[PDB]
């Protein structure tokens, strides 16, 4: 059971049914996803030489889908590829960079031809450090390892901040590159944004920037662990594309497919409900127009 597609003209009713009896059928469906992917090993991530490279020693990339850095255990970063419907490597999911792994993070962005980064955590959340401030504080260039980075703009909007960076690393396919960074600043850990409208607009906005680019590379998405908030963002991106393309939508299949590639993408039942509320809301709006 890989997939549960719902005809869009039947979604409103499907979701009502799932929501009946205090989410009885919603919870049953959600729990069917619990073990997807969990047959897979993270032996490289567990090597003692890699210990300090993991923010959370229990949140590790599967061997089968991990992102590898060029050799300098020098290859290791806590990050995982997510293939697309049409081609490999549509997303890279990663943890919030650590002070000691930020050079590795930027190496990865450089080597993987990444032009867009989506961050859906704050650096400190309820007194706990969740992510290093791994980008410059101002417009003065700085080295991260053998990569030079310079912030060209920082635009603080109501619910996200967009930064543009120029980066140069060890030359392969390119020698210098503009990167955009999308930092969504209103998503509580273990929770959901306060409205569907907010994250739907964020996803649409990011996908807009992606789609308009002559060549985007994999999009890097991270929160603190690269699990709950990253999983929910990516799922919504996929499901929104489904609604713009097809007459059915498959939230269960989207989450299923993410979990094949990194541990338990989408952390909570509430996050699963929120994806359904998003789809419900888009469809209601569209029906009237
Ligand atoms: C200090 N360590 C931690 O907090 C770790 C790692 C972690 C995971 C997910 C997130 N959220 S995020 O991925 O959105 O950044 C942050 C941190 N947390 C966990 O492992 C949490 C622990 C937890 C918290 C609350 C709850 O009700 C049940 C279980 N477990 C957990 O996320 O389990 C998965 C990996 C199977 C999804």
Swiss-Prot record:
Cellular compartment(s): Membrane
Tyrosine-protein phosphatase domain span: 26-282
Positions annotated to bind substrate: 189, 223-229, 267
Induction (UniProt): Up-regulated by hypoxia.
Role, per record: Plays an important role in blood vessel remodeling and angiogenesis. Not necessary for the initial formation of blood vessels, but is essential for their maintenance and remodeling. Can induce dephosphorylation of TEK/TIE2, CDH5/VE-cadherin and KDR/VEGFR-2. Regulates angiopoietin-TIE2 signaling in endothelial cells. Acts as a negative regulator of TIE2, and controls TIE2 driven endothelial cell proliferation, which in turn affects blood vessel remodeling during embryonic development and determines blood vessel size during perinatal growth.
Similarity comment: Belongs to the protein-tyrosine phosphatase family. Receptor class 3 subfamily.
Subunit details: Monomer. Interacts with TEK. Interacts via fibronectin type-III 17 domain with CDH5. Detected in a complex with CNTN1 and NRCAM. Interacts (phosphorylated form) with FYN and GRB2. Interacts with IGFBP2.
The name this protein goes by in its record: Receptor-type tyrosine-protein phosphatase beta
Species the sequence originates in: Homo sapiens (Human)
Part of the whole protein covered: 1678 to 1970 of 1997
């Amino acid at each position: 059971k890989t997939s549960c597609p719902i005809k869009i003209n039947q979604f409103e009713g499907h979701f009502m049914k799932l929501q009946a009896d205090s989410n009885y059928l919603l919870s049953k469906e959600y729990e069917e996803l619990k073990d997807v992917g969990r047959n897979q090993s993270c032996d490289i991530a567990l090597l003692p030489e890699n210990r300090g490279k993991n923010r959370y020693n229990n949140i590790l990339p599967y061997d089968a889908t991990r992102v590898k850095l060029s050799n300098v255990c020098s290859d290791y970063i806590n990050a995982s590829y997510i293939p697309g419907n049409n081609f490999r490597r549509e997303y890279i999911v990663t943890q919030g960079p650590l002070p000691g792994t930020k050079d590795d993070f930027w190496k990865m962005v450089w080597e993987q031809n990444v032009h867009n980064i989506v961050m859906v955590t704050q650096c400190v959340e309820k007194g706990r450090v969740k992510c290093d401030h791994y980008w410059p504080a101002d417009q003065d260039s700085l080295y991260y390892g053998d990569l030079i980075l310079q912030m060209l703009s920082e635009s603080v909007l109501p619910e996200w901040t967009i930064r543009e960076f120029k980066i140069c690393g060890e030359e392969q396919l390119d020698a210098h590159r503009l990167i955009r960074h999308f930092h969504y600043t209103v998503w509580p850990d273990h929770g959901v944004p306060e409205t569907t409208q907010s994250l739907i607009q964020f996803v649409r906005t990011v996908r807009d920037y992606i789609n308009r680019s002559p060549g985007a590379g994999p999009t890097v998405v991270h929160c603190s662990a690269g699990v709950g908030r990253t999983g929910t963002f990516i799922a919504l991106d996929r499901i929104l594309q489904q609604l713009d393309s097809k007459d059915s939508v498959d939230i269960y299949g989207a989450v299923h497919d993410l979990r094949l590639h990194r541990v338990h993408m989408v952390q909570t039942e509430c996050q699963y409900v929120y994806l359904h509320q998003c789809v419900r809301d888009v469809l209601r709006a569209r029906k009237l127009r």
